[PDB]
Design a binder for these strands. Sequence first.
DNA 1: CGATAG
DNA 2: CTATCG
Length: 247
Amino acid sequence: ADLMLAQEYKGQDIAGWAMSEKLDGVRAYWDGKHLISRQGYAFTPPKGFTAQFPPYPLDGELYSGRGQFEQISATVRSVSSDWRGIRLHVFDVPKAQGNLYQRLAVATQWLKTHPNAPITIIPQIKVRDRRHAMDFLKQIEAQGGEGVMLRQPESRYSGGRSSQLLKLKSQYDDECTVTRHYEGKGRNAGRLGAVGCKNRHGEFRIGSGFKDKDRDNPPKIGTLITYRYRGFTRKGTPKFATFVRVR
DNA sequence: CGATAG
DNA sequence: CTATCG
Ligand SMILES: *P(=O)(O)OC[C@H]1O[C@@H](n2cnc3c(N)ncnc32)[C@H](O)[C@@H]1O
């Protein structure tokens, strides 16, 4: 119903937090009877897939292995497919009592007595400091992983955006709406130095990633563009914002 | 003054 | 080498 949503990591201290690998699957909320997607609609898996799920809710990601998102998404969006290989990788037991580790223990005992259920408890590792998190992320991207998830253990499960569940990657990518053009200095005078962009993060400039043709023929105001970035600024806006392509 | 993309 | 942002 009310799905706990993750923010992006900005620089908060995470000493004592619980980190895990960020899985590139499909979000699924188990309400004790149905698998509910982020859009609020129920999935339609084969009968017997959820037959050995617990009668209480579970929040997790429908996942199989690395680099398989397209295969997963295609499999779950159908009503004539095989879900073998797809499991619900659980990252919290929404309605249980205690800290994160005590809530997950509830689902762990269910797996003990239901070993053929297609469920997996996501390992949660204790975080020392920011350097440790970057280290864990560093080796995850090496194995082909996508990033790291950081969770405040003592926190509870709440719906909506939360500062206790943060995404951590080395290179993010998003989209924004071009709002304004800014003339460049020196050898970019009379043409584009940076564009103004707008999205859920507010307004900010993008000055890098532009060819010379892009600077002579910049993207129209109101156009949706894509851009990479790593980390955020003290103002709370994308850092190292690099233009990629249009649309 | 430093790091990045062109 | 030259520009953007950090
Ligand atoms: P990315 O921008 O793809 O967003 C990640 C979303 O997936 C959920 N998720 C995947 N894997 C995990 C783990 N291990 N822990 C917590 N959450 C996870 C996030 O909740 C985001 O919805």
